[PDB]
Design a protein around this ligand. Sequence first.
Ligand SMILES: [Br-]
Ligand SMILES: [Br-]
Ligand SMILES: [Zn+2]
Lengths: 75, 75, 314
Amino acid sequence: KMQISVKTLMRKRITLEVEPSDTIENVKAKIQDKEGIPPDQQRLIFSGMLLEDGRTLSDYNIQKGSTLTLGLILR
Amino acid sequence: MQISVKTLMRKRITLEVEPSDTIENVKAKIQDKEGIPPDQQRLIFSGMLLEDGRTLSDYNIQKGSTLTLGLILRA
Amino acid sequence: VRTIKVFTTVDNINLHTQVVDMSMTYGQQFGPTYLDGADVTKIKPHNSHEGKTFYVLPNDDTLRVEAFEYYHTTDPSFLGRYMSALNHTKKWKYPQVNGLTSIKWADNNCYLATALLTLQQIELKFNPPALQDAYYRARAGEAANFCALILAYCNKTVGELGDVRETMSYLFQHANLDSCKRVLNVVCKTCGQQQTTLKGVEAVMYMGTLSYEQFKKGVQIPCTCGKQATKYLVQQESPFVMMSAPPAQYELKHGTFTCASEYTGNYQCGHYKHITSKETLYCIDGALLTKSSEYKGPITDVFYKENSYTTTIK
Ligand SMILES: [Br-]
Ligand SMILES: [Br-]
Ligand SMILES: [Zn+2]
C-alpha cells in the first residue's frame, strides 16, 4: 500500500560511569558499548564546546553529574 | 563519576496509511510504533503544521512523501 | 508571581515549554528572543502571548543540536541574522508570474528575484532541512522564510546589494551535489596536455564563457610556459550547468538555454533581470513580465540543462 515516512529526532537519557580523567575518545567508546553508536558518527557538545576527540574530561572541566549532549554528524 | 549524556538521534520510520486518514489517525500510528503520545506530537509537511482535523489529501500527502515530526518538550 | 505558558524553539519543529514571569523582560530570562520576526528581547510578556511560539538564540546544548540539525550551521549569529532578516522578507510580496514565484522589488532585492526564479527552473534538492521545508513553501507562492535563509547563508543584510554569480555559490554548497563530476582537459602546444577531474560544487559553476557550446569546443587560458593553452569539457554528469561571465552584450536564442540573468547597470550599483526560455523568451523583472521574440542584452549568467555528456574530441 502507501509508504509514508516520518523524519524523527528521538530523545533519550543514559547514565555513563567514568573516571574524571578519561578522554572523549574513551567517553565516545562508552557510548558505543552502551547504545551502539559508533565513535566516528559521534558529536558531543558541552556548554557550547564541541568535545574534541582527544581531549580528556578534565581539560574541559567536567564535573560529577554534569550532563553532556550527544549528536551525530550528518551521515 | 556517574555522568549522564542525553541522546537525541535521528531516525526515519515508515507508516502505512491511507490517503484519507486523519492527522489524529496518523499521530496514533506513531504512538503504537514508537510510543510518543499524540498530545506530545507535532507533525509538519512542506512547511505546514498538520492540523488535527484535516486528512492527508488536504495536504496532497501522496505515496512516498516525507513528513517531519517534532515534539512539544516540557522541561 | 504572575506567569503564563509559552514555547521556545530554534527550528519551529521542536517546541520547548516555558513559564515566564510577567515582570522581567523576555531578554532577561531567555536571552535574545524574537517572535516570528519581531525582536522582543527588551519587552515584558503580555497576557495575549500564552499559546504562541517564540524564536530564541540557542543557549543550551539541547538547542544547539536542535538548531544544528535543521539549519546546518555552527555560527552562534545565525538565528540572530535569520530572524533579523525574516522580519523584512515577511513584509515583501511574492507575485506569481508566469507560473513562477518571484519577489516584488523592495530593499534592492533584485538578485533574490533571479536567484529564486532560477531555482524553480533547474533541478536542485537542498540538504538542510530548513531549506528543505522553506523551498517547499516557496514553490507554493509564499517564500517569506526562504529569502531569509539565503540572506543568512550568504551573510548578507536586508538592503545589502548582492551578486547572483556568488549568491548561487552558497546554495550549491548546501545542496545535494555528490553525483556531479566534471573532467576538463587542457592542451598546450608545447607541454602536451593535463586532465583535471573535479566533482561537486565546481562541476556546475564556470566563469569564463556563457556559451556551453563553447565549453565543448574550448576556451583559451594562459599556460605555464608563457604561451596559450586550450581548455575544453570532456565529460559532464550533472542535472544542470551554470555558465557565468562578466556582464556583456550577449544574444540569447529560444530553446538554447533554460534561464539567464542580466546585469543592466553600473559597477557596484545595478539591477538584475531574469530571462527564461519558455515557449518564447520571457523577461521577468520581479513583479513585471515582458515577452519578446529575441533577447539581446547585458547577460551575465546562463543556465543549461544537462543529464550526461561525453566529448566527441578524439
Ligand atoms: Br503552517
Ligand atoms: Br600566449
Ligand atoms: Zn604551455
